[PDB]
Design an enzyme around this catalytic site. Structure first.
Site, PDB file in Angstrom:
ATOM      1  N   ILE A  61      -9.725   7.495   8.065  1.00  0.00           N
ATOM      2  CA  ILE A  61     -11.020   7.908   7.533  1.00  0.00           C
ATOM      3  C   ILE A  61     -12.019   6.768   7.685  1.00  0.00           C
ATOM      4  CG2 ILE A  61     -12.313   8.639   5.520  1.00  0.00           C
ATOM      5  CD1 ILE A  61     -10.573  10.775   6.844  1.00  0.00           C
ATOM      6  N   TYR A  83       0.823  -1.201   0.000  1.00  0.00           N
ATOM      7  CA  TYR A  83       0.000   0.000   0.000  1.00  0.00           C
ATOM      8  C   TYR A  83       0.862   1.258   0.000  1.00  0.00           C
ATOM      9  CZ  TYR A  83      -3.980   2.936   1.238  1.00  0.00           C
ATOM     10  OH  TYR A  83      -4.959   3.892   1.255  1.00  0.00           O
TER      11      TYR A  83
END
Ligand code: NAP
Ligand code: NAP
Ligand code: NAP
Ligand code: NAP
Ligand code: UHC
Ligand code: UHC
Lengths: 236, 73, 248, 248, 236, 73
Positions: D189, D156
């Site tokens: 988030i 990632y």
């Protein structure tokens, strides 16, 4: 236009240039602008005559950004005029550019005390005023130089870079009462250097103003401690 | 004392029964730091004038604020 | 060891802690070190005596680095003593940590003139004296808060960030004559600034360092040495980070 | 609201979560949004129906953004439908988090082609179609790990950092015709990627966000909107950070 | 010279240029260098003939950096030649520079798989080999482009920037067994661009090599996750 | 079992008495993560060949490693 949960903004050094038109933009979005001048008031009055002729809300104030008591007294007077203060734009800025060997310690303290210490006072007053209301936004105008550096600006670069680092620290301290601190680093604002900007033009002051506006806005709500590069690509 | 109880208790969501004169603000009444500075600053809003750092440095219980305020009255 | 074309270094505030280690480290690498001291010279003098009994070249000197004239005359004296100055380490630093609402501007200027302004005077006089030999390496000792920022650290953060930006500018001013400026951002470094600090607030940082340990002053010193040495001859204006991973 | 010279935006992977919010946000600001979906179109279709019942312009579209030809033909179809494409948001992202010693290269390429390569195809086709009108704004959705790095996050992190660097390069390639590229680095988030996660490992992050809260997808969406709008007309190649202070 | 607690280093793509002379420098400091080539071995052998003529220790190896099994097998063979591996320099690099509109998806996957995936394999193998010994250092060669970006290098910049970010992540993972991961971003290495470098000259490969050496050294012991800009001031 | 006890206990500084067949590695024997992966990898060094993810995903006690290793023997 943008949302603004707050009500008024104070903009230091806002009689002309960038400062004048952050005032001009923020007032266009429904906020009461407190245009700060330091020397003449013919130009600051002319600005708010332009403003109130257009149906916006403006008001002038005289106080040296460098002076703790003058700035503190002021912020106080605005709090009791408008019942509080919502947003701050630490904009006051001056340069004295020289090579280092041709530069003395006073040519350096001037730019530090007058570009940096002012912003410290402002942000600390921001903490003080906006704590009860648990809300506010502060934006310090910095520079591209406070980031990459420039030859001949050893004092200006120090002042801006310190402003950015302090500003991050103020963001730390102000998050505990929901106050955001952020920074805007403009590139070159209105001709040899045009070749170095990818957008191939000098940035206009309205762009820096609209960046400050986004930062003060509620569209920056989870944005604190950031450094907003408004340089057209000049530094990445 | 009663009023001091009420104002400090308002200042940081605490029941009036919590404030016993040797209830530390952080270990007992559970406060961060800035909150304490603001409590002090709040207590100078009853015009104990500038209870100076030397007492900010020396404050931790709520009997500690009876002192330095009856002193600076 | 490392490999230095230069001969002598001036290290401000090198009586103890990190500065003491930079001095030892460069002394052991063949450089003649000029330890600096503001007030008690007993500690400094002991450091020089240690270095000399190891068979190294050391010498103590007393200015306040925040004083322009004092700094200038001491660098002039060093030039007169050794025929020139090769390397500089701007190490002098102080901390006053208070919340911004309790912080007077005296406590802001204190940290600004001590930590930031002295570095400026050092970098300018380094330009002045190294211009002629067209050779030199300067290293400013910034901090991780100069980059990340911290709470109760508005004055310190301002000073360190200003140091980094101004150091970049000095790299531009002095690059043409091969005078390189660089910076160092240590993480939690186990010297006097940090000893007196809450233990359960201090164990909060070991959590966030991946290296799981407190950094030693010698480890900052050796990075400073590498930035001064001839190895980094193509590195100017870098802000090398030595925090064990606490910031990336 | 904000102020857009453009008319339409394409947002990859906008069926739910952050991408769903960017779509709602731009739809409410007068833009006609092209929600994208890989697999189940029921969720997407529901999002468009919501937007249209609010009296907004929305439309669903199905490519795999990692497929070059699929992406190209869908942008061509959008140009044929609306007479051109104004704005792009490269939002498609996936995560496979494993320790590097258990991570096969399949799990590396998975994240590389999904999160990084699709963004490349989007940026290139955005150049292609916005070149002629000499106007455009693209925003790549990177991450804070694209900047800071993280553990178990090698794939990632690689993809997001590559996104940021490549986005800078695209800003250079497209600046001359006023095609601006920028990036966004959200913090924690509160969308589907993070829901299924250890509660005592998740409360470890609220400690390190100064804003003391989880960020909402709408707050990322509005920053994306500002970078697309005409306000940021002098901002290209910026990596704007929206982590509530988790990184500075 | 410098301290090296470790013993040997593996350097991918080290037959010529930068790679060759990181080998040449590291061997001069007492470490056993494992010079990796991919195509011809005349040049890699010539390098270690230069080395062993000078009394240093060198050894060649053939394996494609892009291939997981070839690289993994190799690292394994070096572990059982030398009883383990100490340091790694992820250096293998290739470019295919084009404008984006003139660039296809294969012109991009080549540079990704061949500049980035190789380094992933290397760092993961590093974790694997160096865990028991609780010691090691890895350094990935990146670029200035992986930082500022360049026009015409949308693939190369992506590969390097991802390498840097991954490298930070590897530093996270490897700190738990005392393994440091860091990055080196060289500027322009050996003429229009000379005006843009403050040091006013092209950097020589020996400088990048000595930077890598400092990073592998024990003078970088508390240095992990950093990105070492060796650019002569070209980017700050 | 005895040998498995010894090797796992060596692998993460733990007394042999700790390893009871339902002693969880993290909640009980106190392990981070990578350490467990390495324990597994260590147990494939006794050639239980690639005890596959599906069992890495399913492992937490030390009776859990008797299973999947007597299975994959
Ligand atoms: N224009 C650029 O290219 C550029 C580039 C990067 C960033 N910036 C920054 O953007 C901001 C605005 O720049 P600018 O172009 O407006 O500068 P400017 O054109 O000179 O206007 C700056 C204003 O700041 C005022 N000021 C200085 N010290 C003050 C003090 N103590 N109290 C009150 N006002 C004070 C100046 O007041 P006086 O009239 O008394 O001088 C002037 O009004 C500054 O922070 C500057 O550093 C400018
Ligand atoms: N330790 C850390 O975690 C850390 C990390 C970041 C950077 N550093 C930097 O480390 C340096 C010092 O290391 P330290 O933390 O170990 O601090 P320390 O133990 O206090 O050493 C600081 C020294 O600098 C001296 N000094 C201060 N102002 C001076 C001046 N104007 N002129 C001359 N000497 C002056 C001191 O003052 P006295 O005469 O008062 O003794 C003292 O000898 C500083 O630049 C600090 O900014 C510290
Ligand atoms: N949430 C955070 O904390 C955070 C912060 C950093 C950045 N972001 C970014 O947020 C974006 C998505 O937000 P999220 O976290 O809320 O994730 P999410 O809930 O999983 O939404 C991701 C969406 O992208 C789609 N997608 C993936 N690959 C695609 C492809 N090749 N083509 C088209 N659509 C594709 C999804 O796949 P399916 O078809 O499989 O549903 C899904 O609809 C990503 O770029 C991620 O990298 C997340
Ligand atoms: N020179 C510069 O200006 C510059 C600038 C910034 C950074 N760098 C970086 O510094 C490093 C060295 O650059 P350089 O100048 O040496 O590049 P170079 O001169 O082309 O040499 C790079 C070497 O990498 C080899 N390589 C590529 N893929 C490989 C693989 N899979 N396995 C093994 N070897 C492989 C090339 O092998 P082949 O012979 O098969 O091609 C060549 O040996 C690279 O990472 C490069 O990206 C270079
Ligand atoms: C430290 C990590 C590496 C730093 C390296 C560095 O350069 C910093 C120093 O010099 S030590 C500088 C000391 N470091 C700190 O973190 C001190 C911070 N403490 C505070 O800000 C307090 O005022 C606060 C707790 C918020 C409020 O007080 P109340 O609770 O009474
Ligand atoms: C999350 C902060 C904001 C991130 C925003 C972002 O973009 C990241 C995501 O997408 S969620 C990505 C999930 N976030 C994480 O932090 C997951 C990390 N977990 C791991 O690395 C584990 O493998 C580890 C615990 C080390 C080992 O396993 P063992 O103990 O069994």
């Amino acid at each position: 236009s943008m949302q603004f949960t707050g009500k008024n903004v104070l903009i230091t050094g806002a009689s002309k240039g960038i400062g004048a038109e952050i005032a001009r933009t923020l007032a266009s979005m429904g906020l009461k602008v407190w245009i700060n001048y330091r020397s003449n008031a013919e130009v600051a009055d002319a600005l708010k005559n332009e403003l109130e002729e257009k149906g916006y809300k403006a008001a002038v104030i005289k106080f040296d950004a460098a002076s703790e008591s003058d700035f503190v007294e002021a912020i106080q007077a605005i709090v009791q005029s408008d019942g509080g203060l919502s947003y701050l734009v630490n904009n006051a800025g001056v340069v004295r550019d020289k090579l280092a060997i041709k530069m003395k310690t006073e040519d350096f303290h001037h730019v530090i005390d007058n570009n940096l210490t002012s912003a410290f006072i402002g942000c600390r007053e921001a903490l003080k005023v906006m704590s009860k209301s648990r809300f506010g936004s502060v934006v310090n105008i910095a520079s591209i130089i406070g980031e990459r550096g420039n030859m001949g600006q050893t004092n200006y670069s120090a002042s801006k870079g310190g402003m950015i680092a302090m500003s991050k620290s103020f963001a730390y301290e102000g998050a505990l009462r929901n106050i955001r601190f952020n920074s805007v680093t403009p590139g070159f604002i209105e001709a040899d250097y045009v070749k170095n900007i990818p957008l191939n033009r000098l940035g206009a002051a309205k762009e820096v103003a609209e960046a400050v506006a986004f930062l003060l806005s509620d569209h920056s709500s989870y944005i604190t401690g950031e450094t907003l590069k408004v340089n057209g690509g000049l530094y990445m | 004392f009663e009023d001091i109880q009420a104002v400090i208790a308002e200042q940081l969501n605490v029941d009036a029964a919590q404030v016993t004169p040797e209830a530390e603000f952080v270990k007992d009444l559970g406060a961060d730091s800035l909150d304490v500075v603001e409590l002090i600053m709040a207590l100078e809003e009853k015009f104990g004038i500038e209870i100076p750092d030397e007492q900010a440095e020396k404050i931790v219980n709520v009997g500690d604020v009876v002192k330095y305020i009856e002193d600076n009255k």
